[PDB]
Symmetry: C3
C-alpha cells in the first residue's frame, strides 16, 4: 500500500459493517434428487401421471422430465424438431386434492425457457437429433436411441427453497399431456410414418429436488398462473375475460397450416440461423435451376420454360437479368436456366412471383467425374419467407399457373413439418406482421403502439433475444413481495382485456398472403397460495 492512501484514512460516525456479516443459522433441511415413473393413459392422446406422496418430502422444486427417444429404423428421410423435448409437451398440470395449483400450455413453458440455453440443449438440440438423416435399407438405423431432459420451469424455482412447493401433508399429482409424435418429427414421403406413429410410445420419468425439512414454518404466498386465448383464424382480435389481478400480458402471432399438407421444399436441420434456412432452400433449387445437358433438358413439366444461356451469359426473365457462367462444360453439352422454377399469379397477364427472378448471378464448374455442377458463388435475393412457404400454396387453386415446375426427384425430397411452436409467418419469426397493437381494459385504451417497443422492453428486462410484445405490470421483487397487478372494476366493465392488431398488408400475388394467421394473447393472473387446516367429522357408513 502506497503512502497517499494511508494519509487519506489516518471520525466515529454510525457505520454499517461491509467487511463482516453474522452467518445466520438456516432452517434444518436435507435436499435429494428424486425420480419417479408415471402412469400412461391414451383422440388417444398420451397422458402421464406422477403421484408424489411422502411424509419426508416437505417441499419440492426444479421439475425435470426425462424422455426415451427410440431407435428409428427403415427407409426415408427423418429428423427431430429442434428442442424436441419441449415440443412433445402439450400441457403440464400440478394439482393437489383441493384442485389445480399451477398449470401451463406446452408453448408457454417453451416460451418461459427460450432464454435458458442449457435447458434448451438438454431438451434435444444436436446434429445427432436435428439433422435430417436418411435410411437406405429397411433395416438401416436412421436415428440411434437417445434420452432428452425437459426442464419444467415452475414459479417454485424463482427463489429456490423460499419459493418451493410446500406439500402440506398431502398428495401432489404432476400430469403431463403429450402432443402427437407428428409434431416432433420432420420426414419425407419415403419414410413410413404410419408404422412409426403406431409403434411409438412416450417413455417419461419425472425428477425433482425434494426437501426434507425439520419443523417447517409454512406461510401463505402468491403465484402467477398463465392463461392463453387463441383468436379466430385470420381475425385481428382476441379477448381475455375475468381479468381481476394480472401481472403481465403477452401478444404474438402463429401460422395456421391446416389448409396445406404441411410439406415444405427445404429444411436446414441442426443449423438454425436465418442464413442456414436460406442456404438450404437455394441448395435444393440449384439442382433444377442451372442444368448442363446435351440438348433441351428432360424430366420437367411441359409448363416449365428452360432457356439456353447465351454466349453473353445473361438470360432475361422480363425485367430481371440472370448471369449464368459454368466452367469446364463439355462441347456436346450446353448451359440451361429454368426461368420459372416456382411461379404464382392470381390474374392472367398480371404480376408474377417467380423464384427464378430472385437470382442475379450463378457461377460454378462442371464435374466430368460426378456429372454434376459444383456451384462456386450464388447472388440471390431469397428471404426467410421463401423457405417458409408450404408447397401446397404453389399449386393452389388461386394460382393461374402450374406453380411447381421442379423435377419429380426434387418434389420427392419435400419434408413434412408439423412443429407446434412456430410463430409469425416464417420459421425464424423474423417478419413482423403487426403494424399496430391496441390493448383495451374494458372500454378504456390501456396501451397502444405501432413499433414493437413492448417486445424491445420484454427482451431487455428478461435478457432474452427472442421475446414477445409484453406489457409488465409487476416491477416488485417476486416471493419477498406481493406482486403488483392491473386491478379490475366490474361495475365499469373494466374486467376484460381486449387486444386488437393491425396486420401488415401483403401482395395477393405472393404465396405467403395465403398463410393463415392466429392471434395469441397470454395473461398471467395472480393467485393466493393458502394452506388448509382444521377438524372434520365424518359419519361411519
Amino acid at each position: 500500500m502506497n503512502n497517499t492512501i494511508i494519509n487519506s484514512l489516518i471520525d466515529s460516525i454510525k457505520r454499517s459493517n461491509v467487511f463482516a456479516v453474522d452467518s445466520q443459522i438456516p432452517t434444518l433441511y436435507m435436499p435429494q434428487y428424486i425420480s419417479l415413473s408415471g402412469v400412461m393413459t391414451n383422440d388417444n392422446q398420451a397422458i402421464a401421471s406422477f403421484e408424489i406422496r411422502d411424509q419426508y418430502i416437505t417441499a419440492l422444486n426444479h421439475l425435470v422430465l426425462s424422455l426415451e427417444l427410440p431407435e428409428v429404423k427403415g427407409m426415408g428421410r427423418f429428423g427431430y424438431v429442434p428442442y424436441v423435448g419441449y415440443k412433445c409437451i402439450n400441457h403440464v398440470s400440478i394439482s393437489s386434492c383441493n384442485g389445480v395449483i399451477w398449470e401451463i400450455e406446452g408453448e408457454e413453458l417453451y416460451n418461459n425457457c427460450i432464454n435458458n440455453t442449457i435447458a434448451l440443449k438438454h431438451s434435444g438440440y444436436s446434429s445427432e437429433l436435428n439433422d435430417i438423416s436418411i435410411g437406405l435399407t429397411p433395416n438401416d438405423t436412421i436415428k440411434e436411441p437417445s434420452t432428452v431432459y425437459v426442464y419444467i420451469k415452475t414459479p417454485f424455482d424463482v427463489e429456490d427453497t423460499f419459493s418451493s412447493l410446500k406439500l402440506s401433508d398431502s398428495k401432489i399429482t404432476v400430469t403431463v399431456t403429450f402432443n402427437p409424435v407428428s409434431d416432433i418429427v420432420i420426414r419425407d414421403s419415403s419414410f413410413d410414418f404410419e408404422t412409426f406413429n403406431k409403434e411409438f410410445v412416450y417413455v417419461p420419468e419425472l425428477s425433482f429436488i425434494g426437501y426434507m425439512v425439520k419443523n417447517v414454518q409454512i406461510k401463505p404466498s402468491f403465484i402467477e398462473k398463465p392463461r392463453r386465448v387463441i383468436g379466430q383464424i385470420n381475425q385481428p382480435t382476441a379477448t381475455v375475460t375475468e381479468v381481476h389481478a394480472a401481472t403481465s400480458l403477452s401478444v404474438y402471432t402463429k401460422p395456421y397450416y391446416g389448409n396445406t399438407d404441411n410439406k415444405f421444399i427445404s429444411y436446414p436441420g441442426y443449423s438454425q440461423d436465418e442464413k442456414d434456412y436460406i442456404d438450404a432452400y437455394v441448395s435444393r433449387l440449384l439442382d433444377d435451376l442451372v442444368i448442363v445437358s446435351d440438348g433441351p433438358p428432360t424430366g420437367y413439366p411441359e409448363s416449365a420454360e428452360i432457356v439456353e444461356v447465351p454466349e453473353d451469359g445473361i438470360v432475361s426473365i422480363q425485367d430481371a437479368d440472370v448471369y449464368v457462367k459454368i466452367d469446364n462444360v463439355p462441347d456436346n453439352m450446353s448451359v440451361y436456366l429454368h426461368t420459372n422454377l416456382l411461379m404464382f399469379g392470381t390474374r392472367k397477364n398480371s404480376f408474377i412471383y417467380n423464384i427464378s427472378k430472385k437470382f442475379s448471378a450463378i457461377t460454378g464448374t462442371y464435374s466430368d467425374a460426378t456429372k454434376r455442377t459444383i456451384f462456386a458463388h450464388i447472388s440471390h435475393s431469397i428471404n426467410i419467407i421463401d423457405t417458409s412457404i408450404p408447397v401446397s400454396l404453389w399449386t393452389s387453386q388461386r394460382n393461374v399457373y402450374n406453380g411447381d415446375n421442379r423435377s419429380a426427384e426434387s418434389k420427392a425430397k419435400d419434408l413434412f413439418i408439423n412443429d407446434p411452436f412456430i410463430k409469425g409467418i416464417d420459421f425464424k419469426n423474423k417478419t413482423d406482421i403487426i403494424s399496430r397493437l391496441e390493448v383495451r381494459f374494458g372500454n378504456d385504451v390501456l396501451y397502444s403502439e405501432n413499433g414493437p417497443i413492448s417486445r424491445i422492453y420484454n427482451e431487455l428486462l428478461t435478457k432474452s433475444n427472442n421475446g414477445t410484445r409484453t406489457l409488465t405490470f409487476n416491477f416488485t421483487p417476486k416471493i419477498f413481495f406481493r406482486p403488483t397487478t392491473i386491478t379490475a372494476n366490474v361495475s365499469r366493465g373494466k374486467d376484460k382485456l381486449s387486444v386488437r392488431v393491425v396486420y401488415s398488408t401483403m401482395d395477393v400475388n405472393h404465396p405467403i398472403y395465403y398463410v393463415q394467421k392466429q392471434l395469441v394473447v397470454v395473461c398471467n393472473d395472480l393467485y393466493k397460495v393458502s394452506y388448509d387446516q382444521g377438524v372434520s367429522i365424518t359419519k361411519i357408513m
Copy 2:
C-alpha cells in the same frame, strides 16, 4: 421417495429459509410511455423530450427509437455496427435546478458493451451492417429500419428502488446526435452530398413510467461521468476538482483528421479479427496475382509486376512468394505485383511492403468469368494493416508512390468515420500503453506496467472489452453510500493527473503516423436531494 439415511440425519434460533412474509409494496402502476421530441440544428442535431405529468411519479429504463430511412441510388453503402449507439453524441437528463445526470456518447456505449441484447437492438444485422451496392439511381440500397438504443442510467440498477423520482418538476431529456457521416460506411460512387442534405434524425423516447400513490421520497447518491480528452498525441491529461470519485478509466483513441477517412477494406456484419483480415486479403488478391496475355496493363509506372517463374517462387528481396495458378490459358502467363503497397522515409533504406507479407498463393483460373478463383492464401497480414488509412500510403513522409493498386481497386475504397474506435486498430487489439501513472495531487496514487487494471475491469464487470480502470467503490450500489477517493484541498490533492508511456513504433511503418488521443474518464459522487424540486449536489 426419501431414503432412510437422510431421515436418520435429521432450542436453536433458526431463520426461515422455506417461507417468507409477502410484504405489501408501495401502491404503484407502471406504464411504457413513448414521446416525440423537438429537433434543433456546427448545425448539430439536438432532440428535446419534456416529461411532466401529475401521474408520472418516477421513471427508469430509457430507450431511444430511431427511424433509419430507405437509402436509394448508386454506390456502396452500409451502417456502422451498433448504429444506434454510434449516432448518440451526448445524453442529458435535467430539471429546473439544472442537470441531474449526463453522459458522452462513447461512455454510454462503453457501459452497454457487455449487454448483447442492448447492442443487437441498437442495429447489428447483415441487413444494416453489410456493405450493400446500388446499381441504378432508383435502386434500393437499404430498406427503412427502426433501431432501439437502451440509454442505461443509474436509475435502472435496483429497478423501482433506484428509479428517478419527479418532485412535481419538468424533466428534460436532451439527445445530441453525431453527424450522419460517423454512422455510415460508403464509397466515392455513393452520393453522400445529397444523402447528408436529405437525412434527418427521427427519434422517439420511451421509458417505464410509474404512478406512485403516496410516495415516500428519501435522499440518494448518484455517480456522474466526466470525460477529459488529452491533446493530440500528448501522453498526459488531467481531471480537475476531484473531491469524491468512485472510479477512473484510461484508454486511447485514434485520430484521422489528417486523413480523408478512406480505408481499403471493410468486413461488414462479420466483425472478428480474422473477418477484417480476410476482407483486406480478398481486396488485394485480384491486383496481387494477375493472369494476363503479356505484361499487365492499368497499373502505375511505379508498379513492379514480375512474371512468376516455372519454379513458382518470386523473390522480393529476402521474401519468397510461391504463386501457382491452375488452368492458365496457353496465350497467358501468371504475374505477381511485387510492390502493391509500399512505405519508406528514405530511398535506399527499410521498406514496409504489403506484397512481402504473402508467402503462398494458390488458385484456379476461370475461362468462363475471366478471373482467378483463389483456393488458399498463406500470409502474415495483421489487424493493423486493415486499419491503415489510404492517405498514409500516399503521404508526404513516403519517398515511394505508395499506392500501386489498379484504379478499379482504388475506386472500391470506403470512408469510415466510426466515432467510438479505440487504440490504433478497428478491433483495439494492439496495446500501445507500456506504463500508466495516476497521481492524486502531487502523490503517486497508482502505477502499472502491464494492463492489470484492465484485467480487473474485465473480471469485475464480466466484460471482454474493458479499459484500464481504477475502482474505488466496492460497496453495493443504492443500499449503501458509495466509497470514494476523498480530496484534501489544503494539501493540494484535488486533481487526478494521468501520465502514460506509449510504446514507440517504427517510422517506416505507416501506423506510426496514426494520431493518438488519451481519454480519461472520472466518476464523481453527487447527492440527489428532492427538496424544492429535483437537484444534485457535488460531494466536496
Copy 3:
C-alpha cells in the same frame, strides 16, 4: 378513425418502501490493486511463494496470477493448450502463521472457472497461442512472447468486501505449484523439447485487490475447502474419509495415458468445437486415404491395401462402399483408395475396426500446378472418439494387425498432447462412460442413479454447459446464512463418502476400449474462520 386515446395508467395499510431506500454509511476503507513478484524454488517441481506482509493491507480478495510466456524459437510444430494459464497450475495454497487457510488442486480451480468466459480468455485462449505454429529455420520465431492472466477464484470473492480474507496482523503466504511445461505444450517430434524444457522458466506475478480498512469490525465466518480423491487406475470406486460437514460432492472420470507415448494423429488448435476436432482428423487422413499416382503408390507399409478406384467410382471394403471421384486426373496417373489406413482386431477372424470404412464419399480436383488433390466434399461417420485415440493403441500388442498403415510423412506430423485437465475418454468429454452412480454415506446408500440426472441438475443450477455428476446439500445463499451440510454420525459409522460407478460396456475390437480410466471424487468440507490470535481455520466436526 386513425386516432387512439393516449391515456396513462388505465388500470387503477403498512407498506414496504419499494421506491426509496436509506443509503447506509459503509465502513471507511480504500481499495488498491497490489502486484508482487515471488520466490522460485525447484523432482525439481516449480513453486512460487508470495508473502503479503503489511499493516495497512487489512483485507484482500480477487487473486490474479500473471505469467510471462517466452519467445519460442527453432524448428518443428508448437502450440499451447487452450487456457494455458490454468493448465500450468498444479496447486494453489493460501496460508498464515497458524497454517493453511484455503487450498485447491489445479483442475478444481479450472473447474470452478469453466463457466467464466472472461477468466478463461485472460488465461490464454487465442489463435496466437493455441494454433499449432511451424518453425522452418533454427532461428525462426514459432511463438512471440505473451502475458497470460489466471484468475485464482477463492471463497473471498463471493460477496466482495463482506467475504474478503482479513489479515489479523499476520503474514499471508500464497504458494503456487506449477505443472511441468510438457503439460501445457502441444508439439511434434521435430520440435526440440529437450532444449525447451531445459531453457523454460515460469515467470509469475501475483496481483490482488487490497483493502485498507479504518477501525475494522472482524466477525467469524465459514469457508468451503475442496478435497480431491483420485481412484486407482480402472477401479470403479473411490472413498473420501473424515466427512463431517460437506456442502457438495462431485464425481467425474479422467483418462490415463501412461500406457501410451501421449502422441495423437491430429489437433484443431484454437478452434475447439466437436466438428473442429473431427475436421482436423479427416484433413490429416485424406492425404493418405485418396492418392493420385502413376501406378501403385509407394511409401506405405506392405501391410497396407491400396486399391485402384474403378470407372464406377465405388471401392468396396467388405460391406462398406466408398465412392471416390477426382476431377482433372492426368492420363498417366490413376486414383487409389487406402482401404485399411488404420485397423484394429483382437482375433484374426473377428470384427475389424477400420477407419477407411468410416468414409462413404470423397470428391475433389487434382491440381497439376501443385501436384496435389484439392478435396471438395467428404461424406464420413468420423466421431470425437476417433480424434481422441492415442497412436500407441493402434499399434498395441492386443492388435493382431499392423494397425498404423499411414505414410512416414503423416506419422511424423503426430502431436504430443499432455493436457492435465482432460475428462472422460474424448477431448470434448462428450461420451458418458458411467452407466450407474452409487454414493454411500458410511454403509447406507445416500444416492443412486442410472442416467446423469445429477449432471443435468449441476448444469441447470450453475448455468454451465460442461458440468459433472454433482450432489448439492446447500441451497441457502452463501455468506448471509451458515452453509447447510450433510452431517456425520461417528457412532453409527457415517463418517465417510464411498462412491461407486458402473462403466458402460465397450466393444473389445474398438481401440477406445483400451483407454484406461480414473475416477475423481471431489468433496467440499465446511470450515470455521476464527480470527483469535491471527487467521486460522477449524474443521466443523
